[PDB]
């Protein structure tokens, strides 16, 4: 990642602020309405402006350390972006910790214009090199960088729906007792249809050869077909800092570690707070993991939390607060009993690995950190 690639992608910015030169730029600020002033006071700036020095002036409060301000003024955009009161953005439903674009929205009318402005924030933060405690959905973080979602990320959005693909995965298409076609329900904008997923779709039934394609293209559709608006927005206001191009240098996993920075990962809380299922805390590959786990630089050991708890977000109360799906999970580790050249796998929702019974530690070892990136 640092070998090479970053620094391309530092080098790549650098090139297009040749001949920039920036100024100092106010932003005028109500304690209470810190937000909406924020977004008054930037939404109508212009991209090249928008990389301008800002300092921020709290109305009527006693003249302040600069400095000090803005890194308050930025922690305060962070969590008032994911206010519920805004209706923006939604916790996933199996991660709980996690956000993406709530297609309800619209309810709010400016929500559109809302959308571009924290997209230019998220952008400016990143391109100054100022970190944000903004967690999101990794499908959300592959929407930025323009990669497609696979089937897996819908576990933790929309658990029945994913039983549901899993299902017709591992099945015969005349097994099921009933025919699929090329077509799904979307509520965008409050508003219900039957979107095709590709030309006459709705008349196109789903075979043995036509269910890779399928399964492809409905969650294409289902991830963001009532957001599309609402993405789109987020994504000109982001790439209008950050070309898309140079921000496409990222893995998903790489750009939350940038926007949000490496996780620390005490590995004695994290040990302190782990379940069992089939293993016991003295399995020989359980004693394997931790020694496997210790041995990573803080590097594998963030991918490996994002893996298996589907954020780098350590709890403020430590993994003992760790949550999921059905409310509060502890790391948990089972025995698959499958065949012994899979890798691991995860369900992120229920904070959960699947360990095959691993001949050797140096196999076990290699096998988690190949998991733990493609
Ligand atoms: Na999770």
């Known amino acids: ?27 005028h600020v109500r304690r209470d309405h810190v937000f909406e ?46 206010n519920p009161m805004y209706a923006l953005f939604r916790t996933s439903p199996g991660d709980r910790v996690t956000y993406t674009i709530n297609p309800s929205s619209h309810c709010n009318p400016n929500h559109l214009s809302y959308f571009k402005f924290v997209g230019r924030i998220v952008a400016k933060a990143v391109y100054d090199n100022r970190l944000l405690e903004c967690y999101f959905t990794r499908s959300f973080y592959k929407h930025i960088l323009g990669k497609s979602v696979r089937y897996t990320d819908m576990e933790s959005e929309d658990y029945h729906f994913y039983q549901g693909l899993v299902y017709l ?3 015969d298409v005349s097994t099921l007792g009933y025919d699929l076609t090329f077509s799904t329900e979307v509520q965008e904008f409050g508003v219900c249809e039957v979107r095709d997923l590709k030309p006459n779709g709705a008349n196109i039934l789903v075979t043995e050869e036509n269910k890779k394609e ?13 957001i599309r608006k609402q993405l789109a927005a987020f994504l000109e206001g982001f790439y209008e800092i950050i070309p898309k191009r140079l921000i496409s240098i990222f893995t998903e996993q790489e750009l939350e570690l940038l926007i949000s ?3 620390t990962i005490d590995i004695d809380d994290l040990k302190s707070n782990t379940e069992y299922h089939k293993y016991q805390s003295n399995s020989i590959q359980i004693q394997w993991f931790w020694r496997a786990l210790r041995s990573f630089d803080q590097a594998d050991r963030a991918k490996f939390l994002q893996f298996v708890t589907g954020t780098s977000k350590v709890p403020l109360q430590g993994f003992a607060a760790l949550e999921g799906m059905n409310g509060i999970q502890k790391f948990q580790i089972h025995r698959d009993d499958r065949s012994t050249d899979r890798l691991p796998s995860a369900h992120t929702c229920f904070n959960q690995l699947d360990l095959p019974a691993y001949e050797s530690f140096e196999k076990l070892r290699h096998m988690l950190l190949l998991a733990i990136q493609e």
């Open 1 to 27: 990642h640092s070998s090479g690639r970053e620094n391309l992608y530092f080098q790549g910015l650098e090139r297009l602020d040749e001949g920039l030169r920036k100024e100092d730029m106010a932003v």
């Open 37 to 82: 002033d924020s977004y008054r006071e930037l939404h109508r700036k212009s991209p090249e402006e928008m990389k301008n020095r800002l300092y921020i002036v709290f109305e009527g409060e006693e003249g302040q350390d600069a400095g000090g301000l803005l890194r308050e003024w930025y922690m305060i955009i962070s969590r008032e972006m994911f």
């Open 169 to 171: 995965l591992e099945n």
């Open 214 to 226: 399928y399964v492809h293209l409905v969650c294409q559709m289902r991830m963001t077909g009532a």
């Open 261 to 263: 920075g490496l996780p």
